[model samples]
Target: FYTAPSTESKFTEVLSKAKLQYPTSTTVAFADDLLDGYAASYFYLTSDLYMQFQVAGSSQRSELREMETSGDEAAWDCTGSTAHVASAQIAIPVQEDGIEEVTILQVHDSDVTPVLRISWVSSITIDGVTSEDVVLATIRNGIDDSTATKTVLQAHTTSRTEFNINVQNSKLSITVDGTTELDEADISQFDGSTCYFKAGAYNNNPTDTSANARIKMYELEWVDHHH
Candidate 1:
């Protein structure tokens, strides 16, 4: 059994633990509706040990609801070893004949696009079967480039998936559910860039107001070895 944080005081305590960027209009008092499951952006599931982030497909600010390592203590250069570990469940809804993709995790650079983006892509076909999956996209050239090398990491199985993204020694390694997905992939293109970790539901669709993206995060941790 699981219980949601009941009071505003408890919700405030939760917010203090991390840096969250949600809808800009949201306030602490309005965020209470989120904890109670009355609004979007953030929700607490009483039946599970998770904090759910929900974003409408059509909204202001591109409908992003994410937690980032934005504080001074968490920010670090790409040259050092840093890891963003989290266990989450993706519950993004897709259309019958359309594409729906959302970013679940990323290493964001302030000046340009994210260096790495983990996205939940919709409608992928394999062996004559169609399904959604988690894909890792990384910038292979300059930080400002719009193109990235995409690789399929795992299938979206509607269960909790553990992710470990380790940036060490100018390379990036990733593990999902204890299995190595990407091992020391070269990331020298943006060596000197300062970046931070971000995770949650970042909707990609802006016109499809009927669509929504949801993510249930059970655990979120950051390990900075540059200390």
Candidate 2:
């Protein structure tokens, strides 16, 4: 829920062919893993990012703002903008005894493009030794086969791109695009307090990965535990 004028440019698969108003409303949903076949919700909003779609009620917004100085002509410079943190319904697999020991992060392929792409994630520094989260779980849930130039978010389209991500951590795959990482596998091993979440972009067409075709998020939710 943020708004900013077009500033930068970047390589992307789908840039909104249709001009949109600033500060548009968008939404993406995280499926309830507890559901028999939990599915990612649909995301509906407005922008030129070429985002197919995601969980409903959950909105994501990106704007083209400025000029780029790098050799990459596809990049832009978004100067001023405002992003609102979305507060959606999270259906976590909860247990009764007060609070559970771990936080389960269930992610899904909740979007519309026929071909969805993901980045190569490779580490989780949460906890200590036990729950390594080290083993890669590609091909399970929405994760694609990481054995080839392919990645969990490669140029492949499936009926549903969903997964049960039980993570309270963050890690980035060294692969720059979907055509690189070969399933090295990674996860967040961190624990406690609050952590951030990030996702790769879907250009629909792998060949058309334009610099402008990226997802830009600004801030996090207004959370204060020190009350």
Candidate 3:
């Protein structure tokens, strides 16, 4: 007999603001297929539009970065101001074993350089052995010095899995499913300047192109305290 657990006040006292943005052309079908035969496409099924990236060789590139709210849907100009809170609910529907890594979500500066990259590890091969690997919901800073990185949550999902990234006041946090994984992170040099957020797939390794990475995202929103 499976029963519903108590949705008590102690659990509900702190709630996540699930306010998503309007999906009417808000999502841009953006990708970086640097090898000419871009294996990326955009699809919509009356609701959400999915951005898919597929690469067949190690010498190709497929990724989506750059968030500008005032740009064309197929352009790299989704840019704006300092976001007090930027978040999204993301899931990797297709991840093969040989792809270097798939970055599910990211926040960027005006230069399109990644300020924060949330990655989902599929599996890694080392010394001719793969231990099914560890799937960690890792937060990384792909810009500036030192490259601050943090592991917020881990998952061993078989089918579809989802996670959340909330960057409030420049502190990047992650929530796995409905549980709080970690929420205490701060990017020191992230001044209150112009910034933007984007969620999609990225293949970091050009040498591991035999595999592809795809993701499905929803509830993408951003909020600011500027009144």
Candidate 4:
């Protein structure tokens, strides 16, 4: 978000008009693997990536990732704009514990780093241990948790969530389904730069493949401001 006016654009997609790309799938995957089921406007993620997690299925890696770039535009020069907002109607359909790790959406700089990521996570053990139905909504300022070189803010919660994320004047405010979560949360340290948005399931798992994460994205919209 910056201080210059951008050419605003809106993206509306039905299941048939959507696109899914798995950049992390080394063996190659398509939209079909991620598009498990959908109604006219709803998109569901019903499976993990085709391959298992890397090398002993480490706990710190994201093996299956489904990502979509922002709109028809390749990139945008959002130089002097200090306000940006992403509004979405989404639902995480499975039981809270059944969902493992998934990135709900992201707004990132080019080269895919320095991202403002909205994520969902549930901790588990490979052999037979885990956490107590702990589902978290995490907001981070970089790539991944373990290796990211940025700050993090998190809330432990679960689904059927709506988000109104407003980034303006060095702060980020969020409202979930009409309930305010983060109002004027400080982000004064954020690096001012150009960026684009991303949404979908970046599935992170290592142990059990029996459970799948699904996100029914009913709507995704963005507004850019420069005043």
* Best candidate (score: lDDT): 1
Per-candidate TM-score against the hidden true structure: 0.70, 0.21, 0.57, 0.55
lDDT of 4 by residue, 127-197 (tens): 35444333333444333343332222244443445777776666666677777766765544345555555
The candidate with the higher TM-score, 1 or 3, is: 1
The model with the greater lDDT, 1 or 3, is: 1
lDDT of each: 0.56, 0.22, 0.44, 0.44
Ranking by TM-score: 1, 3, 4, 2
Q: For candidate 1, lDDT tens digit of each residue in 1-227?
A: 33443333434433333444565334332223333533233544434445566666443222222333333324567766555333334443342233367677777664555778777777445446566555555544567666566667887666677777887777887788888888877777767777666666676654475555666666655544455
Candidate 2 structure, TM-score to reference: 0.21
Give candidate 4's total backbone clashes: 9
Please provide, for model 3 over 155-185, each residue's C-alpha lDDT reduced to its tens digit, 9 standing for 90 to 100: 5554444556555545666667767676756
On a 0 to 1 TM-score scale, where does candidate 4 land against the true structure? Answer: 0.55
Q: Which scores higher on TM-score, 2 or 4? A: 4
- RMSD to the true structure for each prediction, in A, is 5.6, 18.5, 11.2, 10.3
